[PDB]
Amino acid sequence: DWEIPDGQITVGQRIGSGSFGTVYKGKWHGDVAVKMLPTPQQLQAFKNEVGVLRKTRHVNILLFMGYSTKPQLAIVTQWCEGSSLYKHLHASETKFEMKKLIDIARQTARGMDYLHAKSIIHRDLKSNNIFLHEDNTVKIGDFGLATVKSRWSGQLSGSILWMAPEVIRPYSFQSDVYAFGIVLYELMTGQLPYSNINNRDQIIEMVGRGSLSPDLSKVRSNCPKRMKRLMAECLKKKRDERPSFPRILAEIEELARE
Amino acid sequence: WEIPDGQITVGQRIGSGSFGTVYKGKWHGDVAVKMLAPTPQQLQAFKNEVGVLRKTRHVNILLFMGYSTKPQLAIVTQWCEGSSLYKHLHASETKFEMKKLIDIARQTARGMDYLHAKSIIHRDLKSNNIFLHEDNTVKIGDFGLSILWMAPEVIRMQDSNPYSFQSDVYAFGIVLYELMTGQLPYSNINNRDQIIEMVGRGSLSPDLSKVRSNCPKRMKRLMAECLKKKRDERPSFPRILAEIEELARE
Numbered sequence A: 001d002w003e004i005p006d007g008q009i010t011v012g013q014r015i016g017s018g019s020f021g022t023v024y025k026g027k028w029h030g031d032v033a034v035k036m037l038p039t040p041q042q043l044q045a046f047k048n049e050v051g052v053l054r055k056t057r058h059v060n061i062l063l064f065m066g067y068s069t070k071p072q073l074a075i076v077t078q079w080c081e082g083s084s085l086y087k088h089l090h091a092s093e094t095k096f097e098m099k100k101l102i103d104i105a106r107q108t109a110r111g112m113d114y115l116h117a118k119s120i121i122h123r124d125l126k127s128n129n130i131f132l133h134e135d136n137t138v139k140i141g142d143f144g145l146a147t148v149k150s151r152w153s154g155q156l157s158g159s160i161l162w163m164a165p166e167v168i169r170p171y172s173f174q175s176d177v178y179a180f181g182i183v184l185y186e187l188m189t190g191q192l193p194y195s196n197i198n199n200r201d202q203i204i205e206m207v208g209r210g211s212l213s214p215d216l217s218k219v220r221s222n223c224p225k226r227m228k229r230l231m232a233e234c235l236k237k238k239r240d241e242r243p244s245f246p247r248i249l250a251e252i253e254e255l256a257r258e
Numbered sequence B: 001w002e003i004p005d006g007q008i009t010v011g012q013r014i015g016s017g018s019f020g021t022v023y024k025g026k027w028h029g030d031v032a033v034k035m036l037a038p039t040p041q042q043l044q045a046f047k048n049e050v051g052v053l054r055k056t057r058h059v060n061i062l063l064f065m066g067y068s069t070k071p072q073l074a075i076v077t078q079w080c081e082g083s084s085l086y087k088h089l090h091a092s093e094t095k096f097e098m099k100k101l102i103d104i105a106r107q108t109a110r111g112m113d114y115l116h117a118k119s120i121i122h123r124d125l126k127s128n129n130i131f132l133h134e135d136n137t138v139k140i141g142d143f144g145l146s147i148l149w150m151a152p153e154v155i156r157m158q159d160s161n162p163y164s165f166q167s168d169v170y171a172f173g174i175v176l177y178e179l180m181t182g183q184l185p186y187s188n189i190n191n192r193d194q195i196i197e198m199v200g201r202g203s204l205s206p207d208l209s210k211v212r213s214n215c216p217k218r219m220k221r222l223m224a225e226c227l228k229k230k231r232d233e234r235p236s237f238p239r240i241l242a243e244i245e246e247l248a249r250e
């Protein structure tokens, strides 16, 4: 039983607010993050999200701690101190060492490898959803508040660059692998893909039809050969030609030691 | 949480005791695997340990990840890189800054406070069982495979169960004494049976004059309340945690 009774969680500072939820910093036997989401759609979506998080016990996956029903639906997770991968590469524009870049990728592949072993498809893997908690441990969660956390979907502008061709035209282990390849492109170039394109509808049409893919010539000079090859396999147009996370993780782990 | 046979790559042996061997390993990253024909007593003890760990989802508590039955009973937790609090204070005589000492105590009280909210009595809280994982996050587990941390009632062989929230609080007070003095209690006593006889009869308790000069007044008072002979006079972990949290901000 993970239900936290009414009056234990001290809800504090509002961290973020979206169209389908408000996240708050809080106290409950230490620091926590509380997601406040009642209609039957919200009730099914709350229980689906608690059911998926309930299945995760991994260091590289955001620690679910509990949930509440009264006086409002709430999901309690650990507090993540620091910034997302998107904030480090694109806002702080920090230049991590190659060792630190390969370690973030290794930690992300461990979390994704664990998720796919537990039959969990992320569906929204992106640098925004990869937290560099305490600047050392990588925490994969779903910190987005603009979409509903349901089994399947029927305003996705902050996720288009990580969508595979079949996801634009769907959700599988291979579509997460594509998104991870995009994350690898961000680590290896320091930039988001398709920066020269001026419209979102041009990326949607060109990526979807297979005539558009990240430019691997824009990668850092010190980027390893195995990393260039790994990104290329994860970003393949045909999803069946994409590697699985065990093979991705073992390539990053063999690269990290070399 | 059952992990099928052939997923965990069991590697380096980390420790071996009378009833368990811990190994470093791989399973979607780094793991610690505790290995135990299996006896019905040991089958009950394995399921009891998996049942308690199953109830814990806290940053300051060792992350249980899974368990296996074949080809032998195994409990899979996260890997803890670094050293225990006992190793930092007594083996390597690391002299942490007072801010770092209060932070370890704060993290330990958060984990213990969480455990007592989930109706879980540790029963073996000691510096050995407090891991300074990545030298920043405190992980409370049970890495044993303890007399100095036993409360007077626990030390006495009574007809009743002496283990309670208050006996964990006493053990925590001992842990506070170790953080504030850098030493284990009762170093002048020459025999274990003398500590067993004197602590039990209430005539023996740690010497709070041996604490560091820079030790805060609220910390001296907190240790004293946690180390009281009468267990009902000991504070609860919410009050302990709020006193350490108030002290940390000062």
Ligand SMILES: Cc1cc(F)c(NC(=O)c2cccc(C(C)(C)C#N)c2)cc1-c1cnc2c(=O)n(C)ncc2c1
Residues within 6 Å of the ligand: A015, A016, A023, A033, A034, A035, A049, A052, A053, A056, A061, A062, A075, A076, A077, A078, A079, A080, A081, A115, A120, A121, A122, A140, A141, A142, A143, A144, A149
């Ligand atoms: C409170 C909360 C409650 C939740 F329920 C989720 N939800 C998931 O993480 C989630 C949902 C669906 C599928 C998945 C899977 C398992 C596939 C993954 N990965 C994961 C996230 C948060 C959350 C939001 N924001 C923050 C934040 O801003 N900080 C700084 N720190 C922590 C923090 C935590």
Ligand SMILES: Cc1cc(F)c(NC(=O)c2cccc(C(C)(C)C#N)c2)cc1-c1cnc2c(=O)n(C)ncc2c1
Residues within 6 Å of the ligand: B014, B015, B022, B032, B033, B034, B049, B052, B053, B056, B061, B062, B075, B076, B077, B078, B079, B080, B081, B120, B121, B122, B140, B141, B142, B143
């Ligand atoms: C593998 C393993 C399996 C287990 F089952 C337990 N058992 C508990 O943690 C346990 C049991 C009973 C009650 C409790 C409570 C909840 C009271 C607490 N706390 C906790 C511990 C470990 C373990 C051993 N050694 C190591 C180690 O050496 N390194 C370096 N890193 C990790 C590591 C992990």
